Amino acid sequence: NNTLYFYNWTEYVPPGLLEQFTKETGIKVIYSTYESNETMYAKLKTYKDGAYDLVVPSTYYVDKMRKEGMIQKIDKSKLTNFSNLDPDMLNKPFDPNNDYSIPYIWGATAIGVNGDAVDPKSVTSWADLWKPEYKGSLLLTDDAREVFQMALRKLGYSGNTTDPKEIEAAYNELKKLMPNVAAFNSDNPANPYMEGEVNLGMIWNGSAFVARQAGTPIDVVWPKEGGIFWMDSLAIPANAKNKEGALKLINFLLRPDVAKQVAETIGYPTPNLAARKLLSPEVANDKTLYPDAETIKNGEWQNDVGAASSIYEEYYQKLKAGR
Amino acid sequence: NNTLYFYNWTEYVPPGLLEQFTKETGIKVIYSTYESNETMYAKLKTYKDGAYDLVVPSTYYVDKMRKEGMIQKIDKSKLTNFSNLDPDMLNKPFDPNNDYSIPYIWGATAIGVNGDAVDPKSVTSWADLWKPEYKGSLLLTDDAREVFQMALRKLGYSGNTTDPKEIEAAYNELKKLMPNVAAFNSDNPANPYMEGEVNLGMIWNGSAFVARQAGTPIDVVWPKEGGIFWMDSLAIPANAKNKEGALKLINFLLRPDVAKQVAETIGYPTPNLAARKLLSPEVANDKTLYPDAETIKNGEWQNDVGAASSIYEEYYQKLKAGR
């Protein structure tokens, strides 16, 4: 109607996007960002000046906040641009008939490397990251689940365990890694690499792309044990003050030209097909951004772990603090 | 030759600028960034994997690292575009006849408020930041000189004092403010505001521009006591391994269509007069980016403080350490 409140992660919407939206509709969206689901979640339980109308939970946080009654059903009929999303993303259990989420952006977390510092050939697995040769040199994504997933995998047990013994093992493994961990980053992963601070460590693919386009020889080596895969979906907070307005914005974002427009800039893969077709060849050919099913089947997707999410979060906090 | 190693500040080169330089000239340039002259200088006294060919120190560090033999004389004649810069930026004492520096990008630090949360009319002076009404809620820039300048300008004597007496006062006063400091930031001062971590504090004009363009309503109030004005300059390390290629980059950033192209992306005002005339109206007319002569009158450019610099630095570290 008048204003709109869009809470979203850090590097997803570039300048000019929302302005575009406002020209067409005349609805001015006040933009707010975050670096973590957990941060978004908690802020949605306690703050106004966080964001209200449109938020972006990650996929494994959708059923949790739905059964928690934090998000309302979405009127798909209002989303005339829905047919543009490819169904390989729309038969997911966390939301069977896609009623509380719309696939927004997706991507992966691999290993990142400055090729002008480290020959990427040296790095083949998550396990390498633990080598002493990396004392005080890695950047780790500040995401409890990715961090844990990476040790879990390296162990053999993996990604979305529910068995706290296995998770506990992952924890103890991480303790061994911390000495090598020089920084944590869920804002712009790539930056610590550009500022020389780090050489290798974890990184979001959409990120290494903007650094690479920026000038920093940063390769995304897919780790031998997987490649952390994830999808962020839009959602309306149960008591947004402008639902009909969120629908316009969720729909604006489903227009393939918009999607396409943003994907080329941000790197992060789009779960919209029409757009993906018109993807400039250069960006599409990119195997780090659009990995082949050869790799993604050896990769794992980040899913809901249930009441076991308490355990992950708690050990991660311990992991950061003790250190 | 084959490669170039450019060390510059965090948000100055937009993705695509150097890859464009390489297209024309064929010179591959490896990008590396930094957040401070102090870091840059530090690095410049030790790192191969720091940055060698083209570097961007501040106006105030040019005589400092000149007389250290850190940077070498630039061949003006090879910079055909030198005539585009304005004669009101190339007259300064620190470099009488621009033999060591080349005006690249300039700008300023002021007060930034999320209009949406804080009533901009409520703020008006660096002194207002000290009001305990703002506990643990201010963003301060990670620069010794700027942080101290805000203070000096508070208590009168200011900016480039070389008299340790006034500098000591500066410090004490900063302690008397530190309990209000939420965060320090010299990567992108706008970010913490976006993330809703702070609603006000000091901010660089280019950041707030890109934030407002992004979607975050961030006002920049020019402070009563003044408003820190600064200018960044390209220079060539006394012993870069590709001096001539660097001459090419300098000359490239000097071409107006390249100066304008970026100046609208990042907001920070260009010193190249040629492009300023081609400046898109909205950006040219933006009061916050090209502070009217009056604001720049009550303002103060950060100048070299000579040997007294050590004091500034040393005591800033301490203050950071204290809290």
Swiss-Prot record, chains A, B:
UniProt GO molecular function: putrescine binding; spermidine binding
This protein's GO CC annotations: membrane; outer membrane-bounded periplasmic space
Compartments in which it is found: Periplasm
Superkingdom of origin organism: Bacteria
Alphabetical list of InterPro entries matching this protein: SBP, Sperm_putr-bd
Sorted UniProt keywords: Periplasm, Signal, Transport
Binding-site list for spermidine: E11, Y60, D143, A144, R145, E146, Q302
Listed GO biological process terms: putrescine transport; spermidine transmembrane transport; spermidine transport
Functional note: Required for the activity of the bacterial periplasmic transport system of putrescine and spermidine. Polyamine binding protein.
Family: Belongs to the bacterial solute-binding protein PotD/PotF family.
Name of the featured protein: Spermidine/putrescine-binding periplasmic protein
